[PDB]
Ligand binder design. Structure first.
Ligand SMILES: [Pd+2]
Ligand SMILES: [Pd+2]
Ligand SMILES: [Pd+2]
Ligand SMILES: [Pd+2]
Ligand SMILES: [Pd+2]
Ligand SMILES: [Pd+2]
Ligand SMILES: [Pd+2]
Ligand SMILES: [Pd+2]
Ligand SMILES: [Pd+2]
Ligand SMILES: [Pd+2]
Ligand SMILES: [Pd+2]
Ligand SMILES: [Pd+2]
Ligand SMILES: [Pd+2]
Ligand SMILES: [Pd+2]
Ligand SMILES: [Pd+2]
Ligand SMILES: [Pd+2]
Ligand SMILES: [Pd+2]
Ligand SMILES: [Pd+2]
Ligand SMILES: [Pd+2]
Ligand SMILES: [Pd+2]
Ligand SMILES: [Pd+2]
Ligand SMILES: [Pd+2]
Ligand SMILES: [Pd+2]
Ligand SMILES: [Pd+2]
Lengths: 171, 171, 171, 171
């Protein structure tokens, strides 16, 4: 039951639960990315740290969504969390590309939810997504794109040397 | 006269004045709630303080609306302020229910104004209501709902004991 | 590949991956427990906080296992994470009982892994599990049992009052 | 003579003396590695420092073993210390490979002693080796493997440049 729910559609409630699942899936993907770079035969600790930090950020995003769900009087519903798409993540450019694909997918899900909110005349949702998720995603994706460009620039010269230098000097 | 008014409809100007009246009415209701709990035959000071704090918050909301009215070049117009709905407010659950009804009414008025702003293509109004009122209302209503649930849980056990414990340990 | 793996069986490597899955599942269960207690119709914030803290602890346990996996030259392998056993968690005693069942299951998995380590003559694993997991589990389970006893004592008197008092005064 | 010896076999006493010899041999090997990298025609000071630090660590390990020998009432017996396996240590990858081989040999000797302790029902020895040697070895070997992977990655690109960069930026 709820004694507080107001202007909060079942459609938005369901979409928020799905977004929680997507954020937790992303966190899990970043956990796997991080530990892959910590392998003794990979051993790029700046890259490991970068992804471990992202795993934390995505978990925090899920938690913020869940807090909002409860603030509005909706009910959190959890589903199975699928394992990440890969067991091994290839090179640093491969990994950074995968991360961009992942963030773009989260960003599109946020845009889809916003569109739903707007269609449902739910301005609290719009404002929530704006100042807490959409700007953060744009900033993160810019950072990732910058990183990808730098590593691509480096590995076009010499791959081993380039991966080492990027990890040491950027990350 | 105004030398600054831009994209600010007479409809929004009037709705803002009405919202000021609603916020000042709410402040007055909370003043009455607060002093009822300060009666020597009621004597629940945490409850008195909770409502007195809300009286302040609602007055501050009205003042923020008035400041915005002037920033946009609209003209504040004040109307009579009707007295609160009750002279005596019953039990703590009765009072908390009344507060939730009141906040939901303010929240609906904010949503109605936002809808008007959106219909009038007035994005300053949308942004103003978002970051200054709509989030605050959602947070407050969640707090009130939490409080109501706790007091209901307590007075289902033993009413006198429950009201005392809630006032001492939550408020 | 690995250039470091020594005295680390494929059996232990696989069991460690399974234990990671169990710890991440436990973290997910505690996330769901926490947010259930944050519902406006439940509203026991000390209970929410208790479970949210446990969600963090279990995630940290998984991360420690993964770090150890890599230290030994094993390879992390992630599987799907099943959703928690319940969507709604009942009363505080119901929830605390569920938590004890969960921790006992983790403890048994640790004991099973230790037995495997001992059978595989892997003293690093034994020492790792000892000073980092087994003592922590015993301490946590004692705390949970103490909590369950207190809430049972309280709700045998009066359920609503008891749940409120436990949340306010213990948690 | 001893007035304190209890549950301490002659087999374990002898094995501890042999382990002291192995640790002192390792210290000597690291001394030679360190000074090789300090040669004016090698001149990789981060590599020199890395190995000199290890020489200290291994000497400290021997001293801890000797202290334990006396704590248990066993008698330290010293043997000749053989010179290191090489006079010149080749490239940075050559040296790091040699270090890994050396640490694996110490780790295996620790495992062999632990197995003896367990067979002799000597839990003090097990606990001593656990919290003071086995974890330290696993951590060190992981670090070495990480280093080897990085230098291999670098010298696969360009050897001179790679050796310089590793010494400057990792060490
Ligand atoms: Pd790492
Ligand atoms: Pd890391
Ligand atoms: Pd960081
Ligand atoms: Pd919007
Ligand atoms: Pd928006
Ligand atoms: Pd917005
Ligand atoms: Pd008062
Ligand atoms: Pd007061
Ligand atoms: Pd206050
Ligand atoms: Pd809007
Ligand atoms: Pd808005
Ligand atoms: Pd806005
Ligand atoms: Pd909470
Ligand atoms: Pd909480
Ligand atoms: Pd805490
Ligand atoms: Pd053991
Ligand atoms: Pd053990
Ligand atoms: Pd142990
Ligand atoms: Pd030197
Ligand atoms: Pd040096
Ligand atoms: Pd140093
Ligand atoms: Pd042992
Ligand atoms: Pd041991
Ligand atoms: Pd031990």
């Amino acid at each position: 039951s709820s004694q507080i729910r107001q202007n909060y559609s079942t459609e938005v409630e369901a979409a928020v639960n799905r977004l929680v699942n997507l954020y937790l899936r992303a966190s899990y993907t970043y956990l796997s990315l991080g530990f892959y770079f910590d392998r003794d035969d990979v051993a790029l600790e700046g890259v490991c740290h970068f992804f471990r930090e992202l795993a934390e950020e995505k978990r925090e995003g899920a938690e913020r969504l869940l807090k909002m769900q409860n603030q509005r009087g909706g009910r959190a519903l959890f589903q199975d969390l699928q394992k990440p798409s890969q067991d091994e993540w290839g090179t640093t450019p491969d990994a950074m590309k995968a991360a961009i694909v992942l963030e773009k997918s989260l960003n599109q899900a946020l845009l889809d939810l916003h569109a739903l909110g707007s269609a449902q005349a739910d301005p609290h949702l719009c404002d929530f997504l704006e100042s807490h998720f959409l700007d953060e995603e744009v900033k993160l994706i810019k950072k990732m794109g910058d990183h990808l460009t730098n590593i691509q620039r480096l590995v076009g010269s010499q791959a081993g040397l380039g991966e080492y230098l990027f990890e040491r000097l950027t990350l």
